[PDB]
Assembly symmetry: none
Homo-oligomer: 104 residues x 16
């Protein structure tokens, strides 16, 4: 009943993208969600194209999707290994359904 979630971000300067002075609202929303889930022992793993290029090749699902749609298709979110979202971050509603947690 609990689906596993893996996020492949675009190339960013830090794992959360929340480094600099201008805060992207969507990056903050998803980082807060991930940190909430983490507090509860639910791990959403994320990758950064700048830090781990190889996983964007070695994951065949992500690789084939990037071949068709390009790096502009990032972020890609996998749910149980299936592409579930592309170009925007999953909605908190999606994250609650997938994890069975009730996130604000």
């Amino acid at each position: 009943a609990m689906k596993k979630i893996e996020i492949f971000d675009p190339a960013m300067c830090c794992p959360t993208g929340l480094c600099g002075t201008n805060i992207n609202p969507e990056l903050m929303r998803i980082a807060v969600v991930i940190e909430s889930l983490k507090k509860q022992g639910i791990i959403v793993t994320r990758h950064n194209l700048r830090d781990e290029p190889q996983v964007y090749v070695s994951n065949k699902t992500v690789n084939d999707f990037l071949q068709k749609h390009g790096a502009d298709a990032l972020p890609i979110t996998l749910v149980d290994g299936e592409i579930a979202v592309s170009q925007t971050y999953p909605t908190t509603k999606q994250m609650s359904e997938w994890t069975g947690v009730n996130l604000d």
Copy 2:
């Protein structure tokens, strides 16, 4: 795919921000309002302006202003995509919004 494009829509003067007030009830207005709300839910903001409510923006925005000089106000609504005129007289089709946005609408 392409990077998502910024979309900003300049409505005619209407009695409410969505045009869904009153009697005429143009289904286009409902189509585009539904699209805008679906995007909002996904964290994508399509900024709208209403001439009746924010007249100063139709001036301050140089692109919108000039187009209006050279076509009149019967050219509203104007939709800018990454700052440039993309559609006028009519609201962007769902196909276009879907293309500019990367979101599979409907």
Copy 3:
């Protein structure tokens, strides 16, 4: 097939979708009512701001208001009796009452 009738709170326009802030529940039910309308199915709705008298003349709505106040709105009648209060019917409900797949 069942008759559905909706008594809204007082709103500034018939769908409540006037202002800058769109209530997602209002747009949901408006979209449903428009789809029904296109199937030839008419879900009558009332706005307390414009049709105050119907909230008095419908006895079932009137008695419910005496007991619970405007807080109870919207009220949805289904074949003449209260089926939903305070929130709009779910799309699942509408489909079941109309037999249309929304």
Copy 4:
């Protein structure tokens, strides 16, 4: 009138301190506060000892306090130019009372 709030962080690798995989919850809390304030037009400026060492010297109130207690006193928060908090970030309650903004 509006109390001016200015925060002097310890040395960090980015302006919010949210630069790695482990999110320090205090750094996240204060970043979210500053973002919510910024949405209201209220600007809380902050400095990072790593990139602006000079301002920690030229600000007399900060410099005197660090001469006394050392860099371990950071973060220091000034409210209208006076030291209001050191060692820890201001609480959300404090930030709320100083700005007149509900930060729940």
Copy 5:
């Protein structure tokens, strides 16, 4: 110095509340005051709970007062950020004393 006056209306269908056939005389009176003030360069800003729900939450002074007394307390008028009137609109006399403008 000039007292800042800011009015938080109940939910209404338009910014002045003068949106139908029956003119509420209090709404008319306060609209005329605000217009006369605006002619003198004095800006009384007002909010409508219907279109700006968020500001009734983010303004701490208004939010605390509504948490306590509920939406029936509206209109609330702030003078220099403090609650000066609730339940009813400020009288013309009050508005006149706060602004130094004769509003007969």
Copy 6:
């Protein structure tokens, strides 16, 4: 001695046109006059082209005038059923003479 007054406005977003933030001085003047007369049991009926198109057709005097002069000729004021004013609202002086009241 008291003439009956009926005003046919242009298409407006509300019966008084006083809905939004910018107050047209002439709309406010005429709305205040109408409300004063109303307080005294003198009824000036007004129409809005947006809300009652049909009356702009069914009143032959207004219909024939609109055929010649167009909607740009609105507002049209009838006094005892005769066109008396076009394009501007009647002067308060006119309103006092027609109603026998002494309006400010």
Copy 7:
């Protein structure tokens, strides 16, 4: 009919806002002042400027300024109708004011 048009009149430099001071006593000035007052009574405002009193407006207003570059100040009075030059050297006739305004003057 047409919508009423905005009228703004830029006088020469005169010793008073209406020019009705002193000895010369040009009847045109009286004609236009009477027209302006009749409009005022009906809630229609014709804004006037006097060069002697508000010099900065003859600069800040780009249209007025340029015309003055290219004709001189002997081109005053200038009348703008909806922002554009409509008359110069002389005051608008009553026929024109009447046409721009929808009011039956005289």
Copy 8:
């Protein structure tokens, strides 16, 4: 036909129509006097600011001022006696005194 003569308060110019604020009564009487002038009919007016001596030498105006002060102005004489004080003659009056239809 009757002689009309008007003694204004002190004003900044002969018609009082100088400034930004036009007094509608002043423009009314100025327009009347100009129409008369064109019929060949001269209504003499005085301005206290420029012709103080005439307010002394006309005995009727002088005595009225001693009793009522500058408050009494404008004074209109009609065939040499005070006909109007404090406001300008109505257009109806002017027409009657001149026999011209204004």
Copy 9:
């Protein structure tokens, strides 16, 4: 901080009152003061009852004072919005003390 000085003259034929052959020495004295101040960037605004009757009504402090004492009280001088002088113009000494400018 700078005291704001605002002068409300009687009705006059021009803004300085220096409009004829006989120079009133008080009008000349105060015009020269205002000119010297203007050279220093200090703006003393003045009003003429003849051309701005409305401001004598809308300014509550001036209006109340004239309701009480009549137009013979003019000139009235406000310093920071309060009545500081009436009947006569402020002395050069007063103007000098209020502005910090030597007006010999």
Copy 10:
């Protein structure tokens, strides 16, 4: 030893030219000088082309000078009936020498 001084100004809106809000420094200087001399029973007569055109014709000295140089040559100052200055106002130094007074 005391020379008689007569000034013929350009067309101006009042005898001193000091009527409006913007004060020409030279007009103020010469008006103050004239008023000082007047206080001492020394009369400097001045003319305004707007108020007395005829004297600009009937004075042959001024007439012949205007024929050659035009109205742009005004102001013209006569000293004992001789043209003494043209286009600018006499210097206070000139005025002191001509009158035998020691003006500031």
Copy 11:
């Protein structure tokens, strides 16, 4: 005669506002300083700028700036007469100052 014309002079960068400091001692600088002072005494102000002291005015003044783009700074001093370039490289002759000013200099 003509109305007096406004004269504004933009000096090169000099160690003092008049250039009368030091050793070289160009008699032109003394000529023009004497003229300027004679005018001052008669209530006529010739505004001077020194590039070294007020650099921002050589920018803010659009006319001066453009001329400098298209000729270099070896074009200083520039003299404006009623706002327009009248002389460059050299200071206006006394004949010109006398003509622009209506004053009989020397």
Copy 12:
């Protein structure tokens, strides 16, 4: 709030007084202070009696003090418009306390 500091130097040959071969150490010290302040956006304006004689007369506080003590009292330093120091330049410590800037 920021104390405004304004310095009135004696007559000197250049604005800093550093115009010859012998550097007066007090002039150098205060120039360096003013430069460091200017780097922080804090403007200490200064005047030179030689080039701005007029401001020493029009500033009433300075003028009164010089009338009393003569030019030998210069430099005079005003802090918020009041005399704070005369005869000598303010010490670096004073400048530091008035501005909140560490000037070591």
Copy 13:
């Protein structure tokens, strides 16, 4: 013909005509000295800021300074004795001492 020599106060440049404020007396005497120079007549001037030693070595100037201080400057010597103190010679004076018509 008489030798003229001028000892200025300390000034920022040899004529004192450096700054934004021109002292009319300084320009007057500078113009005179330049006209003389052109007639081949040299009026030597000293600036206390640059030539302090000459104010000591000229005994007449030195003694005058001991008694009256820098307040006495400018001092003008004419054939070696003090002719003017505290103000510059008038143009009339210069003409008389040089025999040139200035």
Copy 14:
């Protein structure tokens, strides 16, 4: 072990170039260094092309360098009579090494 230093500046308005309101940071740095060394009886002589043109000709080293590189090559610093720096002022580090003093 102590090298003699002579600086030939560009044409400047005063020996230090520190005369005017805008302070060139490099001119201030080198002037402070020179003044420090002077306090210690170490004399760095400097020339100004405006004040001593002749020394720029009579020093053959400077003369030959200017023939090749032009006045734009100034400032030229000699150390024991050898060109050591051109176009910029010597670094404080250079000055310390050359003089054997430890300058800040």
Copy 15:
């Protein structure tokens, strides 16, 4: 020789002001950073901007902006020498920096 020229460099968007962070590690970035630091030591300041950090400067600077309109952002880095485009796509060679600066680099 020539007067030293002002040099201002507009970097691409990078994760740090020098680009010396991470993995790729373009030796050009190290070359230019070393040059910039050698100049700094001699009191010569080469101002750098990073698009990621100071986006507003890439707008406010009209020259940089226009070039970007007409070439794209793949034209970064742009180097201005006395305000004008001198190099794009690549960082100035040490020879150029040395020439613009009068400093013998390396």
Copy 16:
């Protein structure tokens, strides 16, 4: 030839040359290490922020840290023993240890 190994303090990037303020000592040692690398000579460096475990497993570095704390960093090992603490090796030192002329 001697093995050189450098244990940096925690830094934000491998050379510490990330930010707006360049530490001249860091650029000096980075330039040296790059020149060595080009001679085929590898001076391994560690960053405490990314490789914490190596500061524990190297016993010599570990014991030094227990005694002196992170204050001791950077530590330079030369043939396995501490040669420099708290500052980076001088270029002279690097040349001597590598035998390369830097």
